[PDB]
Amino acid sequence: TENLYFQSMLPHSVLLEIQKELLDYKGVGISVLEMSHRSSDFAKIINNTENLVRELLAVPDNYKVIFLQGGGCGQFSAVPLNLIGLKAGRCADYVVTGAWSAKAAEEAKKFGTINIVHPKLGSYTKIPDPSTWNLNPDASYVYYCANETVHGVEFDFIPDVKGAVLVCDMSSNFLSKPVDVSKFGVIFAGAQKNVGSAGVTVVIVRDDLLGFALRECPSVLEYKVQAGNSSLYNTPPCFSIYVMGLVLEWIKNNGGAAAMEKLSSIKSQTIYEIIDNSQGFYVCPVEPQNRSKMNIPFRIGNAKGDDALEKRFLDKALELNMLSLKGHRSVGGIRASLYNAVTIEDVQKLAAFMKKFLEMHQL
Amino acid sequence: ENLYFQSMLPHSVLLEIQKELLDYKGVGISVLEMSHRSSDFAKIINNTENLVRELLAVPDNYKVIFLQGGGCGQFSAVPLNLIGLKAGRCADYVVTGAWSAKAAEEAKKFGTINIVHPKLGSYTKIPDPSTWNLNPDASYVYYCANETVHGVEFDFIPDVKGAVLVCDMSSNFLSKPVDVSKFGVIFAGAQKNVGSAGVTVVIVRDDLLGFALRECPSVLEYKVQAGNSSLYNTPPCFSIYVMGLVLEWIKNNGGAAAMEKLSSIKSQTIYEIIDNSQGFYVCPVEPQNRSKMNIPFRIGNAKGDDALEKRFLDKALELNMLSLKGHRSVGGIRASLYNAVTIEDVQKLAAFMKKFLEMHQL
Ligand SMILES: *Cc1c(COP(=O)(O)O)cnc(C)c1O
Ligand SMILES: *Cc1c(COP(=O)(O)O)cnc(C)c1O
């Protein structure tokens, strides 16, 4: 009886490797946990992590790749602090398609005048039509979240923001597919969701965007400072950068971002087919054109969800050792998380369970 | 195997980490994959906090939070949370080395910073506290307990006329008991003495929350983080786990009191050799202020003898003793003597020093 976890996870071979190397990394006589950030040994590690980010995503040479502490929510502060002063107005445009872009917009209010570019959504079930976005020509930047982790809304295109600096929260689908980096001013992602373990955040920053940081910006969070120090302004989250490195290498060894995209396709289409042929039994609230490949929320019984049937679904799932499928407090129902490390075989099992559960309970 | 005079983990901690990596206590999941919102992790961050409270005897009116951004994070996080306490937005700073100097410089981004004493010509002492020019309208007074690069350590708590006292304890945190009730904020990067890089522990008096500036990033705002048990966003889960073990090891080895006993033995072994080398090994810090954590010294003369110093480090290395090179901005030699660095380890360093003094002194 081993557990199946529909949440973020490390590939198994990556844990084996961490574990083997833990007391005496590669023969250096020391643990990465113990390694000075000023050592040529750590320099090599951090260098290889930057390199892998650039290779895997195909990051053009006019972008800085930096590794920061603070996580996603750190960047909700760091983005405005670094960038709201791009133009003197200190205005920014925000696109709000879920809980995460909502928090980000709320946070940015501390630093400037935030314009939410579309009518506020009643339910987070779609991306408001980008061609109706009410953009500020004097916005310092336009901000949006690529993948809304709790609501299952994912951008599968790069919106036209009329030449503005585009900033993107990519935390929960980072390196789940190729990305045309050159469309962006800033991309960021906490490593934990998809690309490693908590403690580090990758920030990709166009090289012409440094140098507008507010006075109040903490130095550890200032893109200019961090990029001029190759992420060693202070002590970075060493082990996390190490762990990320090994995950990125794993992505490379698995065929790269393109392979990841193929594996998300398969995984989600498996689950979405079941929903879309359940003739009402499973109800995903997201308009199909905006459905996440990473997080699939749904209800059981009907669109408002049937509490009894959902409890039984979770209870039985727990009984089969399928963990972490409970939908978020704010949405209710079920959520299936399908990151790079969640295998096709895991997902085949969830699917088989859903089909059986349908057979038994659909009146 | 080697011997490192730098921050390390106790060997036994690393053994447990490795033992449990793939499957934390039979739960079927790594601490590295653990959801920060799970009951499994809740146990952990709860255990870690309680060990701090226990090991330093933190009073009840203090919050203990775990944050990202490092000691340097706190260089901003302190003023951002507190410079606004009094409306002038001033802080007094005591600058006794590299780190308090950075801290004082960073704090300029958020208020008017006054350095309480004249600037030292060289970091070789704590300028006497009665000579300090304290501002009664300052929001708080800031100092660095242990200067890692210059070997200058407070062995007392400064009288700041009742001001809110703020103290960077990164490099000597839990090497001794601390009267926490005397402070407004204590903070510490975990990596120097207490664990691994990626978490910073902040001890904050609960009446000092919500004076934070509007510009304070929520994840660094004491109030936000304390009101959420450091679970406002995803915490550095692994770093917290690791630190928890380290504190557990301190506890099992006799707590803050025993570390102080160790720190005394370890450092007096080196300072003994230094002071009786009749000028062969010279330590630049005044005796009354010398660090128990970091021991910087020159060989040959007070200014350092390059040939003797190279040879020292050369031979040290051949005896597998690593990381003894003094910091690039100071030259010479530095022995770091954190908790994890044993009496047996220092014992070998000392033997070497005596014999090097023997083979080379004229
Ligand atoms: C997890 C999440 C965040 C927040 O990340 P933290 O490290 O907890 O601050 C931001 N955006 C998305 C899409 C997320 O899934
Ligand atoms: C190492 C050190 C720091 C640096 O902290 P970071 O985590 O690297 O930002 C701060 N204060 C003291 C006393 C230190 O020794």
Curated annotation (Swiss-Prot), chain B:
Q: Identify which cofactors the protein needs according to its UniProt entry.
A: pyridoxal 5'-phosphate
Q: In which pathway does it act?
A: Amino-acid biosynthesis; L-serine biosynthesis; L-serine from 3-phospho-D-glycerate: step 2/3
Q: Which GO terms describe its molecular function?
A: identical protein binding; O-phospho-L-serine:2-oxoglutarate aminotransferase activity; pyridoxal phosphate binding
* Result, substituting residue 79 to A: Has no effect on O-phospho-L-serine:2-oxoglutarate aminotransferase catalytic efficiency; does not affect KM for 3-phosphohydroxypyruvate; does not affect KM for L-glutamate; no effect on function in L-serine biosynthesis shown through in vitro reconstruction of the phosphorylated pathway; does not affect secondary structure; does not affect dimerization; does not affect thermal stability
Effect in UniProt of substituting residue 147 to Q:
In NLS2; uncertain significance
Outcome (variant: residue 171 to L): In NLS2; loss of O-phospho-L-serine:2-oxoglutarate aminotransferase activity; loss of function in L-serine biosynthesis shown through in vitro reconstruction of the phosphorylated pathway
Q: Modified residue N6-acetyllysine is at which positions?
A: 43, 119, 261, 310, 315, 325
Q: Which reaction does it catalyse?
A: O-phospho-L-serine + 2-oxoglutarate = 3-phosphooxypyruvate + L-glutamate
The residues that the entry says bind pyridoxal 5'-phosphate are 71-72, 99, 148, 168, 191, 233-234
What does the UniProt record note about how this protein's activity is regulated? Answer: Phosphoserine transaminase activity is strongly stimulated by increasing the ionic strength.
* Superkingdom in the source lineage: Eukaryota
Q: Which residues carry this modification: N6-(pyridoxal phosphate)lysine?
A: 192
Name a Pfam family for this protein. Aminotran_5
Keyword annotations for this protein, in alphabetical order, are: Acetylation, Amino-acid biosynthesis, Aminotransferase, Disease variant, Phosphoprotein, Pyridoxal phosphate, Serine biosynthesis, Transferase
Q: What tissues express this gene product?
A: Expressed at high levels in the brain, liver, kidney and pancreas, and very weakly expressed in the thymus, prostate, testis and colon.
What task does this protein carry out?
Involved in L-serine biosynthesis via the phosphorylated pathway, a three-step pathway converting the glycolytic intermediate 3-phospho-D-glycerate into L-serine. Catalyzes the second step, that is the pyridoxal 5'-phosphate-dependent transamination of 3-phosphohydroxypyruvate and L-glutamate to O-phosphoserine (OPS) and alpha-ketoglutarate.
Recorded disease is: Phosphoserine aminotransferase deficiency: Characterized biochemically by low plasma and cerebrospinal fluid concentrations of serine and glycine and clinically by intractable seizures, acquired microcephaly, hypertonia, and psychomotor retardation.
Family membership noted in the UniProt record:
Belongs to the class-V pyridoxal-phosphate-dependent aminotransferase family. SerC subfamily.
Q: What is this protein called?
A: Phosphoserine aminotransferase
Q: Upper taxonomic classification of the species?
A: Eukaryota, Metazoa, Chordata, Craniata, Vertebrata
Q: Which gene encodes it?
A: PSAT1
